Amino acid sequence: AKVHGSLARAGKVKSQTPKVEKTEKPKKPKGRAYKRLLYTRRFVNVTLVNGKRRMNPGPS
Amino acid sequence: GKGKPRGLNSARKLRVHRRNNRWAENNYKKRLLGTAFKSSPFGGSSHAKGIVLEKLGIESKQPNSAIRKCVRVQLIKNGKKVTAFVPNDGCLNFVDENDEVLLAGFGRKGKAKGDIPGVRFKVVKVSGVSLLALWKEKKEKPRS
Amino acid sequence: DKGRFYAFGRVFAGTVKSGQKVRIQGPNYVPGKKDDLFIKAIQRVVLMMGRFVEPIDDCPAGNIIGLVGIDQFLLKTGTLTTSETAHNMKVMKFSVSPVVQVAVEVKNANDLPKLVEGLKRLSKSDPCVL
Amino acid sequence: SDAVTIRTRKVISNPLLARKQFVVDVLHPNRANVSKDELREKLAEVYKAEKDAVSVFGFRTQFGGGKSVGFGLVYNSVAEAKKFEPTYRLVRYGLAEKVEKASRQQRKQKKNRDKKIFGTGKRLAKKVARRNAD
Amino acid sequence: PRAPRTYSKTYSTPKRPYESSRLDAELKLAGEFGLKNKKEIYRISFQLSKIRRAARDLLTRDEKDPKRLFEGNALIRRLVRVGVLSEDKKKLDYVLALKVEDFLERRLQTQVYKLGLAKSVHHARVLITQRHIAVGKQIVNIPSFMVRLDSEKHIDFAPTSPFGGARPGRVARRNAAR
Amino acid sequence: ARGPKKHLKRLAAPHHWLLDKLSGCYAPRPSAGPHKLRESLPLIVFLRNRLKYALNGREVKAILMQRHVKVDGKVRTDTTYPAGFMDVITLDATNENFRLVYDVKGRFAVHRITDEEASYKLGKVKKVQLGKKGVPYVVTHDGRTIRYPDPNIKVNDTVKIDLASGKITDFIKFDAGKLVYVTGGRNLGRIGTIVHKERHDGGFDLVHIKDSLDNTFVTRLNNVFVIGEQGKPYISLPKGKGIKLSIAEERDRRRAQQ
RNA sequence: GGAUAGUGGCCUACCAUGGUUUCAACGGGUAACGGGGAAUAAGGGUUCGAUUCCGGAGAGGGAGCCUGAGAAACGGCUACCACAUCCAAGGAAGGCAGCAGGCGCGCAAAUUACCCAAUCCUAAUUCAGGGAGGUAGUGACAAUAAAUAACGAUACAGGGCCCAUUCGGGUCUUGUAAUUGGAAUGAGUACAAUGUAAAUACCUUAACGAGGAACAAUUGGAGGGCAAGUCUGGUGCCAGCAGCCGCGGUAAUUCCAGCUCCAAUAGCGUAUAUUAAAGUUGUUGCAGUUAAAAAGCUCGUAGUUGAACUUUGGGCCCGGUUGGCCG
């Protein structure tokens, strides 16, 4: 039953988290090329089959 | 006969239930009675500015633990007292006393969202800039 | 009027033309990283005389000229430039630092925006109360 | 510019005002467009007229180029052409000269000041000359 | 206060947008025919909804109905002109049975693939956006032309095209000059 | 609205002049004259967008006062003159005479008439009454008045004005078996024969007309126009002769032509 | 009987006590000018509609009035009411809800620009004028099309099948490459032509205009509905996330950072209102014993519904539509 709670811990996780830079990656083809990349990576070049199709399998 | 009139000339008779029994619907009396116009503190609009008067903090309700870092804003139109809540972590530092802040709803159309009790208005714009771009370091708030 | 102050200034290099992209640098600005550096252009140029606006499109360097399109970015002092590394000038040392203080309150209703805009007005009008 | 081969379509005769109106289509292969005066010179001999006897307008360039569609007129006489054709196209090539009447807003201000003065105002001009000489 | 120019939208978003089966189905068609976004397929599906809805109101009438025949004869003539319907099944039944494939393979990109001026569906997209291929004597830049089997004999490289004679090319000029 | 209104905006215009919508947002308002505003055709669109001699308004303006166009015998120079039904346009040069008649589709036509036909004009008498001094006079649908008519002339008949001295030269009685032109309504532009008509003495007198192809249509007496008897017309009919084939037949007719 | 241009309690004098109303009169408010229409969906239906067209009202709130065919005109006057300019103090001149533009207010809405060249209108009338109107400037209100990239040759990894001459070629392939090559135009530059009163824009087109460090595309999520991790590091019921259920109290599939993926794409998210969802408004088409609901029962006005019965048939012909031997 209080309305004057402490206002000191705001922005704590954001300040204490480690800071790293975005890792550079090769440029992606934007447009019809990207959807073709979707075309090949889904049916044409599907790798992990097993029992059901997975999108982003993790390290087993 | 289902308990309803079925006369060939019973249109007015069937109409008077339809005009009075429809009052039970929430959408009816909340629209054409002026509740948003005279009872709601927002005036039946989408956005509204205001001025902060103090900094408050509310805890959480059932099984939970969080001080939500709420704010108290007086709207510039109706001159009423409304408790707001910033939906963003760490934005208490950027806001300060005597600040012109633009707020809006929560998406619930007039009830409290979750573990935060009482508040129904969310801070949108602060001193002409926004809190979303503020966390991304895209824009910096002006001093005055 | 209310919050449309024309910023008096002196031009040293470059010919100022109304409606030109302007990079405003404040006292905290440094040429090394991000600062309060905005790219807002100037609306127009107004000549200073006995309380009336004189529109002028362009003015060369070496003169003293006030501009319009400012006062919602700067607080006390600053420079408007276009060079990528235009260093700011030295900080002005005021005569006397604030010593005497009083507590300001109001017995009326919630006129807080009015009082804060008033104190902002004094702050921008002269090296007044900080 | 190379083998324009101007072809005329929908040619009609109008003795009502003594001129012929038609839609002209042209083709400009391996060339951007064609300038207006060349059509006028090239249309003079086909309809027996002279250089300052044909007036043309339009020629919206088709997407991709190589062909243009416009509408053209031919005037029988020079004196006749002056009293039919408006001034905007007459001044265009060589047939008129538009003397600038200062500007529109200046004319309105001068006209309003004329209304504010009753009469010629020359009596008013000298009356204020003596009364404001001091 | 001029007359308001009429404008309308040519696609409708579905009432059920998130079905994994649906996305796999449309992605197969979009990639096969060389589509950049999902607006194009959503555009022609609205036309499928329109033409099926437009055909529906004729079957609500008895045969030999004066409105039904004139609209029906005009309907079958238009869809047989564009070629989405076969010549000998003009019985106002396969128009409703018409699938998305029929309206999709009449696209100019597909016919460029059929005539082998690109050898790849992606190549067909780049030769049509660069105004390299024309029909008859008019150069077409829009990928979607819905050639109606009457101009199909005039799909040919434009006279003002780098590949079909004309100027050698822009980038090739600098290399030759260098 | 503080008196009369002198303007027409380019969306309240009746469709029968077939004017566009993008080329300006106003309409060339015809002035007051022989026919009603909604029942007439202005000369501005008749000379520019109908027959295509002129391309601009000022071009039309200079044409009229140069004394070339002659309407109803008189020259006239008003740009906004309300040309209507059975109005003869006389041209000195170009040797063409125009008579504006409703077409088969239901709009004004571009029918070309000879000079002999242009010598006379047929009209629809509205009222016959003994005016001041007791002299009887009749009024046509254009408002032109002819005095001292023949007793046998009654309401809803046809007259033939000499168009030169303003005197009648021929009349047509209204009875069964008379060629009739419908002028108004949703079924205008047709010609048939008069067979019978119910009196309906409460207003809006109704007549039944059968087309040459046994196509029976019903229209009020306020829209009819007698143009002759059965098989013998007093005027040169426009092309098509108002048969009004079924909508499928124009497609057949257009397909046959190409 | 007066007045109007006209009928009329429009007003006046007399006479009579009449006129409307549970078939919702009268009175309250309308974030109510009405309609033509828009949203949204099988049908039915709901909401909105100042706003491009028509018909009405206003020129700040009333009243009176001038001329004028046409006005109770305010970009015409007169009185009062509230503002407010100029003053060398007598007074004069006022209504931008006309165009720009200024202030207050508000979540919310642009230039104190050009041209009568177009579509018309007005005048004595081609000629003059029209912030009517058009053009330009700002503009991610909403709508349409559509950039950011394609193609060869080498190294792996393949599938039908030829040799069955050893695990050798694999002759045709589909992709992955800290592999390399040509050809291609556009954005942006603008010589030039057309465009426009003059211009500014579209397109054409001398010429300049990719090899990625480049000419670089974003908005949210990855526990369920809701397709997209049992990846790494940090905090440890604190910070927080979350539209709901729900995760965090030192092993976070949900917090914060990096990788990847997913949805849309120059679009995406958020807040309010409406619609289908809603058979949760049910005339079509709800339920009423226990989920909320048969009035304690009876009589009865208005209203609603309401028995059967009264022209059934049989013959004589005629002409129209469909398909049918005989093409």
Q: Of F49, F16, F44, F12, nearest to F28 (Cα)? A: F44
F10 and E3 within 8 Å at the Cβ level: the answer is yes
Q: Give the bridge partners for F181, in sequence order.
A: F191
Whether E1 maps to a domain, the answer reads no
Provide the residue count of chain C. 130
Structure determined via = cryo-EM
Q: Is residue B139 a contact partner of residue B129, using CB atoms and an 8 Å limit? A: yes
CA distance E155 to E127: 13
Residues 6 or more apart in contact with residue E137 via CB below 8 angstroms: D67
The DSSP annotation for chain E comes to -PPPPP--------S----HHHHHHHHHHHHHTT-SSSHHHHHHHHHHHHHHHHHHHHHTS-TT-HHHHHHHHHHHHHHHHTTSS-SS--SSSHHHH--HHHHHHTSHHHHHHHHTSSSSHHHHHHHHHTT-EEETTEE---S-----SSSGGGEEE-SS-SSSSSS--HHHHHHHH-
* Cβ-based contacts of A43 with chain E (< 8 Å): 28
CA distance C92 to C97: 12
Please state whether at least 3 CB pairs lie below 8 Å between chains D and E. Answer: yes
CA distance D132 to D126: 10
Q: Is A36 helix (H, G, I), strand (E, B) or coil?
A: helix
Q: Which amino acid does the sequence have at B112?
A: A
Burial of C44 (0-12, 13-18, 19+ CB in 10 A): middle
CA distance D92 to D98: 10
CA of F74 to nearest chain D CA: how many angstroms apart?
Answer: 18
Report yes or no: E107 at the A interface, CB cutoff 8 Å.
no
Strand (E) or helix (H) holding D83: helix D78-84
Which partners does chain F have (≥3 C-beta pairs < 8 Å)? D, E
Burial of F83 (0-12, 13-18, 19+ CB in 10 A): buried
Q: Are strands E133-135 and D67-75 parallel, antiparallel or unpaired?
A: unpaired
If you search the block for the tokens 């001999």, which residue do you land on? D45
Q: Give the bridge partners for F102, in sequence order.
A: F108
Q: Is B22 helix (H, G, I), strand (E, B) or coil?
A: helix
CA distance D6 to D66: 12
Whole-number Cα distances in Å, E173 to E57, E130, E167, E177: 60, 18, 9, 6
Phi and psi torsions of E56, nearest 5°? -55, -40
Helices (H), D5-52: 36-42
If you search the block for the tokens 């308004």, which residue do you land on? F57
Q: Of C60, C57, C52, nearest to C10 (Cα)? A: C60
Q: Is residue C122 a contact partner of residue C129, using CB atoms and an 8 Å limit? A: yes
Half-sphere exposure of B11 (CA within 13 A, CB side): 2
Phi and psi torsions of F183, nearest 5°? -125, 85
Q: Of D91, D100, D54, nearest to D74 (Cα)? A: D54
Q: Is residue C101 a contact partner of residue C49, using CB atoms and an 8 Å limit? A: no
Strand (E) or helix (H) holding C17: strand C16-17
CA of C60 to nearest chain B CA: how many angstroms apart?
Answer: 30
Q: Of E114, E137, E118, E116, nearest to E127 (Cα)? A: E118
* Cβ-based contacts of E70 with chain F (< 8 Å): 247-248, 251
Q: Is residue F121 a contact partner of residue F112, using CB atoms and an 8 Å limit? A: no
Task: Name the residue among E3, E66, E74 with its Cβ closest to that of F25.
Answer: E3
Q: Is C83 helix (H, G, I), strand (E, B) or coil?
A: coil
If you search the block for the tokens 């504010």, which residue do you land on? D116
Helix, strand, coil fractions of chain B, as percent rounded to 5:
20, 25, 60
For helices E121-129 and E108-115, what crossing angle results, to 10°?
A: 120
Q: Is B102 helix (H, G, I), strand (E, B) or coil?
A: strand
The C1' atom of G296 and the CA atom of B11 lie apart, in whole Å, by 32
Give strand letter and number of the nucleotide nearest B114 (CA to C1'). Answer: G242
How many domains does chain B fold into? 1
Task: Name the residue among E24, E31, E36 with its Cβ closest to that of A31.
Answer: E36
Burial of D101 (0-12, 13-18, 19+ CB in 10 A): exposed
* Cβ-based contacts of E2 with chain F (< 8 Å): 10, 21-22, 25
Which partners does chain E have (≥3 C-beta pairs < 8 Å)? A, D, F
Phi and psi torsions of B58, nearest 5°? -115, 145
Q: Is D127 helix (H, G, I), strand (E, B) or coil?
A: helix
- Give the resolution value in Å: 3.9
* Cβ-based contacts of B51 with chain C (< 8 Å): 110, 112-113
Q: Is residue D42 a contact partner of residue D97, using CB atoms and an 8 Å limit? A: no
The CATH number of the domain holding residue C74 is: 2.40.30.10
Give strand letter and number of the nucleotide nearest F55 (CA to C1'). Answer: G118
Residues 6 or more apart in contact with residue D31 via CB below 8 angstroms: D1, D2, D65
The DSSP annotation for chain F comes to --S-----BTTSS-GGG---SSS-SB-----SSSS-STT-EEHHHIIIIIS-S--SHHHHHHHHHTT-EEETTB----TT-EE-SS-EEEESSTT-EEE--B-SSSSB---EE-TTGGG-EEEE--EEEE-GGG-EEEE-TT--EEES--TT--SS-EEEE-SSSS-EEEEE---TTEEEE--SSTT-S-EEEEEE----TTSS-EEEEEETTS-EEEEETTS--EEEESS-BSS-PPTTTT----HHHHHHHHHHH-
Helices then strands, counting H and E runs in chain D, come out as 5, 4
CA distance B42 to B36: 7
Q: Is residue C117 a contact partner of residue C3, using CB atoms and an 8 Å limit? A: yes
- Please tell me which residue of chain D has the smallest CA distance to E142: D63
Neighbours of E17 (CB within 10 A): 8
Q: Which of A32, A38, A54 to mutate to test the interface with E (most CBs of E within 10 A)?
A: A32
CA distance B11 to D55: 73
Q: Give the bridge partners for B123, in sequence order.
A: B103
Whole-number Cα distances in Å, C86 to C31, C36, C80, C91, D91: 7, 14, 9, 15, 53
Q: Is A29 helix (H, G, I), strand (E, B) or coil?
A: coil
Q: Is residue F105 a contact partner of residue F99, using CB atoms and an 8 Å limit? A: no
CA distance A42 to E125: 22
The angle formed by the CA atoms of residues F190, F196 and F201, to the nearest 5 degrees, is 105
Domain that residue C35 falls in: 1-92
Report yes or no: E6 at the F interface, CB cutoff 8 Å.
no
Which of E:59-98 have CB within 8 Å of F?
Answer: 66, 69-70, 73-74
Domain that residue D89 falls in: 1-134
Radius of gyration of chain C (CA): 17
Q: Is residue D26 a contact partner of residue D51, using CB atoms and an 8 Å limit? A: no
Sign of CA dihedral C120, C121, C127, C128: negative
Protein contacts on strand G: list nucleotides below 7 Å from a Cβ: 23, 31, 41, 48, 52-57, 69-73, 103-108, 114-122, 126-127, 129-134, 142-152, 174-176, 178, 182-186, 191-198, 202-214, 216-217, 220, 222, 226-231, 233-235, 237-249, 255-266, 270-276, 280-284, 286-288, 294, 303-306
CA terminus-to-terminus distance, chain C = 22
Half-sphere exposure of F254 (CA within 13 A, CB side): 7
User: Chain F: which residues have CB within 8 Å of chain D?
Assistant: 52-53, 55-56, 58-59, 62-63, 68, 91, 93-94
Please state whether at least 3 CB pairs lie below 8 Å between chains F and E. Answer: yes
The angle formed by the CA atoms of residues E51, E55 and E57, to the nearest 5 degrees, is 130
The angle formed by the CA atoms of residues E143, E144 and E146, to the nearest 5 degrees, is 135
Q: Is residue C68 a contact partner of residue C42, using CB atoms and an 8 Å limit? A: yes
Q: Of B46, B41, B127, nearest to B79 (Cα)? A: B41
Strand (E) or helix (H) holding B51: strand B50-55
Whether E5 maps to a domain, the answer reads no
CA distance F119 to F235: 12
CA distance B133 to B103: 16
How many domains does chain E fold into? 1
A6 and B57 within 8 Å at the Cβ level: the answer is yes
Domain that residue B52 falls in: 1-144
Q: Of F96, F92, F80, F10, nearest to F40 (Cα)? A: F80
